[PDB]
Amino acid sequence: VFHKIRNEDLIFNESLGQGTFTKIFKGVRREVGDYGQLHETEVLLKVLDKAHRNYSESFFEAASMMSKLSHKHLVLNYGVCVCGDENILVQEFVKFGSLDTYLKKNKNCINILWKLEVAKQLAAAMHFLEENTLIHGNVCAKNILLIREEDRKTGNPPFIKLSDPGISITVLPKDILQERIPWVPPECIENPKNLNLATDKWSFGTTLWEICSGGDKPLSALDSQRKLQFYEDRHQLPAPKAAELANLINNCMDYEPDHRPSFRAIIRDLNSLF
Ligand SMILES: O=C(Nc1c[nH]nc1-c1nc2cc(CN3CCOCC3)ccc2[nH]1)NC1CC1
């Protein structure tokens, strides 16, 4: 499992946000680096809520997966802080935060080139998970982290990474399973044991919607009840103004899991644009 990192070396700084039953902070780690050097490294500290500690098994196994593989688009895990009454994951601090809020805050300066480049990097990471027969389970723009911006003054591209899935939808309560419509695929609302590789093909389609909709949240005007009726009337998401990917979004968000294209195919289609 995890490298154990002592409390004496971690220093909690500013709240950066929250996830599902989790508090997320910028931090500082003291450590001996390469050549016996001493570093004080910026980290990310993710605390499992005090009330929801019973979820700690899924909370840590979800991070356990990312640390079992190694790929340039997967977020690095440094270890777990050892306190006592706490569950703290220490992870790679990414300077530019969530694609989620980056898209909102930059909604007007994103040409479909920048979008397409980020989608290719995301499919690459999802294709690597697919060949390893490994389920993520929570592909959403808020689980995507921006290592590097475009540098509009050179021709460099952005570079993103993919973070933890967090607590499994296997165990979360149903009210929590139903606001993440349309990220949770329709079979998993039926019963979360429908979790399969095919889950990520649906959710990737929803993230593709988010990336094109300047950070709107799909179906944000609907409450839970209506979100369920969205799936029972088997509707689709509307096509974004930026519409070049509306077909790919729909092919990915297929109501039959066995028909969702492989990420091999998703990449090829994604590459066939000018
Ligand atoms: O939410 C997460 N955030 C991070 C993981 N590693 N590094 C981060 C992270 N890094 C962050 C950095 C900022 C500061 N910048 C302010 C303006 O420019 C953009 C962000 C804010 C929030 C940030 N979160 N991780 C998992 C998906 C739930």
Swiss-Prot record:
Primary place of residence?
membrane
**Modification sites for Phosphotyrosine:** 35
For site (Breakpoint for translocation to form PCM1-JAK2 fusion protein), what residue positions does UniProt give?
A: 175-176
GO cellular component terms listed in the entry, alphabetical order? caveola; cytoplasm; cytoplasmic side of plasma membrane; cytoskeleton; cytosol; endosome lumen; euchromatin; extrinsic component of cytoplasmic side of plasma membrane
The record's account of tissue expression is: Ubiquitously expressed throughout most tissues.
Annotated signal peptide:
none
How is the polypeptide modified once translated? Autophosphorylated, leading to regulate its activity. Also phosphorylated by TEC. Phosphorylated on tyrosine residues in response to interferon gamma signaling. Phosphorylated on tyrosine residues in response to a signaling cascade that is activated by increased cellular retinol. Undergoes Notch-induced ubiquitination and subsequent proteasomal degradation which is mediated by ASB1 or ASB2, the substrate-recognition components of probable ECS E3 ubiquitin-protein ligase complexes.
Q: Which UniProt keywords apply?
A: Adaptive immunity, ATP-binding, Chromatin regulator, Chromosomal rearrangement, Cytoplasm, Disease variant, Immunity, Innate immunity, Kinase, Magnesium, Membrane, Metal-binding, Nucleotide-binding, Nucleus, Phosphoprotein, Proto-oncogene, Repeat, SH2 domain, Transferase, Tyrosine-protein kinase, Ubl conjugation
- Specify whether Ligase is a keyword of the entry: no
Keyword set includes Iron: no
Domain Protein kinase, first and last residues per copy: 10-274
Q: Which GO terms describe its biological process?
A: actin filament polymerization; activation of Janus kinase activity; adaptive immune response; apoptotic process; axon regeneration; cell adhesion; cell differentiation; cell surface receptor signaling pathway via JAK-STAT
Subcellular location, record wording: Endomembrane system; Cytoplasm; Nucleus
Highest taxon listed in the record's lineage: Eukaryota
Return one GO MF term.
SH2 domain binding
Tell me the outcome of changing residue 82 to F.
Answer: In PV, THCYT3 and AML; risk factor for Budd-Chiari syndrome; somatic mutation in a high percentage of patients with essential thrombocythemia or myelofibrosis; leads to constitutive tyrosine phosphorylation activity that promotes cytokine hypersensitivity; no effect on its ability to up-regulate potassium voltage-gated channel activity of KCNA3
* Quaternary state and interactors: Interacts with EPOR, LYN, SIRPA, SH2B1 and TEC. Interacts with IL23R. Interacts with SKB1. Interacts with STAM2. Interacts with IFNGR2 (via intracellular domain). Interacts with LEPR (Isoform B). Interacts with HSP90AB1; promotes functional activation in a heat shock-dependent manner. Interacts with STRA6. Interacts with RHEX; this interaction occurs in a erythropoietin (EPO)-dependent manner. Interacts with ASB2; the interaction targets JAK2 for Notch-induced proteasomal degradation. Interacts with MPL/TPOR.
The task this protein performs is described as: Non-receptor tyrosine kinase involved in various processes such as cell growth, development, differentiation or histone modifications. Mediates essential signaling events in both innate and adaptive immunity. In the cytoplasm, plays a pivotal role in signal transduction via its association with type I receptors such as growth hormone (GHR), prolactin (PRLR), leptin (LEPR), erythropoietin (EPOR), thrombopoietin receptor (MPL/TPOR); or type II receptors including IFN-alpha, IFN-beta, IFN-gamma and multiple interleukins.
Q: Which family does it belong to?
A: Belongs to the protein kinase superfamily. Tyr protein kinase family. JAK subfamily.
* Disease field: Chromosomal aberrations involving JAK2 are found in both chronic and acute forms of eosinophilic, lymphoblastic and myeloid leukemia. Translocation t(8;9)(p22;p24) with PCM1 links the protein kinase domain of JAK2 to the major portion of PCM1. Translocation t(9;12)(p24;p13) with ETV6. Budd-Chiari syndrome: A syndrome caused by obstruction of hepatic venous outflow involving either the hepatic veins or the terminal segment of the inferior vena cava. Obstructions are generally caused by thrombosis and lead to hepatic congestion and ischemic necrosis. Clinical manifestations observed in the majority of patients include hepatomegaly, right upper quadrant pain and abdominal ascites.
Cite the domain annotation text: Possesses 2 protein kinase domains. The second one probably contains the catalytic domain, while the presence of slight differences suggest a different role for protein kinase 1.
This protein is called what? Tyrosine-protein kinase JAK2
Organism (species): Homo sapiens (Human)
